[PDB]
Amino acid sequence: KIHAYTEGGKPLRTIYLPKLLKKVFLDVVKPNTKKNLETCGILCGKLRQNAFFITHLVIPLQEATSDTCGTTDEASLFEFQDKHNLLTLGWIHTHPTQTCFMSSVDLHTHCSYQLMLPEAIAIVMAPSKNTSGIFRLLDPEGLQTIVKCRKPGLWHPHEGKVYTMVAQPGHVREINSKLQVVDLR
């Protein structure tokens, strides 16, 4: 009934996102957001009849500071997804104090997810601003920009528009569905 396309005309399969996930994620990582610490997680799920369903929010082993967060033991993350046949459909993280945008680090991180899965999304929570966003890189121009990029330094800039908010509801559609939250910390 409704189809979304990339900038280059490639069709994106739909990802069904449980309406609950954003709220439960903030709740699960609230201890860190109080301590001014960023947190991340993985959106996992399944492919059914040409559509993706996010079924699991997975909080991986990770280290964080006030402006960064990163995984540390990806092997256990792997073991969980493989054992349960979970596809990686994107990721989520908090900006405890900042605005709702994709930083230079977010873009380089996400480029790799979107390369492995054209529909992959990045959810950004800015709870101190009560905003949130769901983003992807422009396909193909933004992917190509970040893939070619070799600039040093954490916070370096990029030439041109590199990312955008995902199409709703064609690419991502929030629905009332079940969710499992898996905390591996």
């Binding site: 960064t68 990163g70 493989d82 990721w91 930083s103 680090v105 390369l115």
Partner: protein
């Protein structure tokens, strides 16, 4: 290289590489950056439940023809 191995992702993809037993894990990542556009430091490779260290080789881990490795991306947030 002189044998073929497979790198299966958590996204339904399967990468195929030609490699040497004496290729380092770091070499295998470089071949993946070449073929898929993923920087090596974002990659973690896993075989038989163990995660592979950049400086060791496929022979160190007993990885032979048509073996399957598993790729899990790191997450770095800002």
């Amino acid at each position: 290289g002189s044998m073929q191995i497979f790198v299966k992702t958590l996204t339904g993809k399967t990468i195929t590489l030609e490699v040497e037993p004496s290729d380092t894990i770091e070499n295998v990542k470089a071949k993946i950056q070449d073929k898929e556009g993923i920087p090596p430091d974002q990659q973690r490779l896993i075989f038989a439940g163990k995660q592979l260290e950049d400086g060791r080789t496929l022979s160190d881990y007993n990885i032979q023809k048509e073996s399957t490795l598993h790729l899990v991306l790191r997450l770095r947030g800002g």
